[PDB]
Design a protein around this ligand. Structure first.
Ligand code: NAG
Lengths: 161, 195, 14
């Protein structure tokens, strides 16, 4: 799919299968991407997983999972909040919002056609709060170069007109 | 008609909850209708059951799931509204399905390193406390002869180092929760870059 | 109590 990173870059990745969008001390955002057509390197999201890592005093661990045709307004355990008002799910419709007040984080999930669309708003200090090992996070440093869609000649002719 | 009161849910197992209620109005040919629902999957309607007793055994429920419960009374033409809802969450069950979407890629500039990315099992049946990654150059080796790599349950990515170059490697993940280990994924073959 | 410059991320179909 198309990616807009926390660092403001825009890119188009193949990234077939499971890939971490966010992998930090607070949150995990994992996506599954499928080729839009068998031939193509154009892929789209059919699964979103979000792990709201346990935060002592605020929430217990909560897992949200959306898949094409199934966008619930609750966590995997049929729960709608944290173990008080620190973490909450809101349905708006086909269109869901997670409000992680305890971490200033908001996750927006929408089904657009046969595929999923995701957007995360997160504070800079928390989004950059991960260990050196957690270096694959598409929201932070994009997808690896090998996964990026390069036209070059075509994009260059497009910009040149 | 007065709606039933004192609706309570007693968790008996990973798929059974006993619902009990009191009737303030009370032998007669009246009957109770119990309704239940969860918020998983999206847009599920209410399941129902009739009970001639002040209790009902709700079975076939999903493990580790918060269910909604309310009952109404019907005596001929006369029928009450639904009671104030009671909630009940089924206990954990061992994971009954493998981690999903197991993908393996080469790490950029680090050929002896791979990255394993996966998704939680569809049937986690509880809070996932860990994953176990198994790897081998022989897909037919007995499982105890595979490399065992336990990993936390709240991360869906893990980097494996020190692999041999130009070599086919087989990978399989397994989920773990308070109740135990679930099944393993089908092995995913990845061939490390040559040089 | 529990209550915490924002960063934005998006992923949208090809
Ligand atoms: C309960 O009983 C009424 C009357 O016999 C019937 O219409 C209704 O479908 C029953 N519900 C269930 C779930 O058995």
């Amino acid at each position: 799919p198309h990616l807009r990173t926390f660092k403001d870059n825009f890119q188009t990745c193949k990234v077939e299968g499971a890939w971490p969008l966010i992998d930090n001390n607070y949150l995990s955002v994992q996506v599954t991407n499928v080729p839009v057509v068998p031939g193509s390197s154009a892929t789209a999201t059919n699964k979103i997983t979000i792990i709201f890592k346990a935060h002592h005093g605020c929430t217990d661990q909560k897992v949200y999972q959306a898949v094409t045709d199934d966008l619930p307004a609750a966590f995997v355990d049929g729960t709608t909040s944290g173990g008080a008002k620190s973490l909450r799910i809101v349905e708006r419709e086909h269109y869901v919002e997670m409000h992680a007040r305890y971490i200033g984080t908001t996750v927006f999930v929408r089904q657009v056609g046969r595929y999923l669309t995701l957007a995360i708003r997160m504070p800079e200090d928390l989004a950059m709060s991960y260990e050196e090992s957690q270096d694959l996070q598409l929201c932070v440093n994009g997808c690896p170069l090998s996964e990026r869609i390069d036209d070059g000649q075509g994009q260059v002719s497009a910009i040149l007109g | 008609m007065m709606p039933p009161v004192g609706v309570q849910a007693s968790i008996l197992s990973h798929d059974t909850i006993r619902i009990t209620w009191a009737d303030n109005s009370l032998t007669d040919s009246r009957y109770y209708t119990v309704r239940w629902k969860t918020n998983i999957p999206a847009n599920t309607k209410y399941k129902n059951a009739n009970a001639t007793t002040l209790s009902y055994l709700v079975t076939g429920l999903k493990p580790n799931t918060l269910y909604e419960f309310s009952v109404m009374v019907t005596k001929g033409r006369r029928s009450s509204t639904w009671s104030m809802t009671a909630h009940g969450a089924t206990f954990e069950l061992v994971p009954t399905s493998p981690p999903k979407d197991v993908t393996v890629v080469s790490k950029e500039g680090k050929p002896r390193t791979i990255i394993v990315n996966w998704q939680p099992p569809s049937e986690a049946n509880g809070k996932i406390t860990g994953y176990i990654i198994y790897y081998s150059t022989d897909v037919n080796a007995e499982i105890h002869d595979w490399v065992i790599e336990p990993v936390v349950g709240n991360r869906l990515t893990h980097q494996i180092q020190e692999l041999t170059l130009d070599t086919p490697y087989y990978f399989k993940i397994q989920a773990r929760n308070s109740k135990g280990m679930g099944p393993m994924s089908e092995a995913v073959q990845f061939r490390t870059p040559g040089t | 109590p529990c209550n915490y410059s924002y960063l934005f991320c998006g992923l949208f179909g090809d």
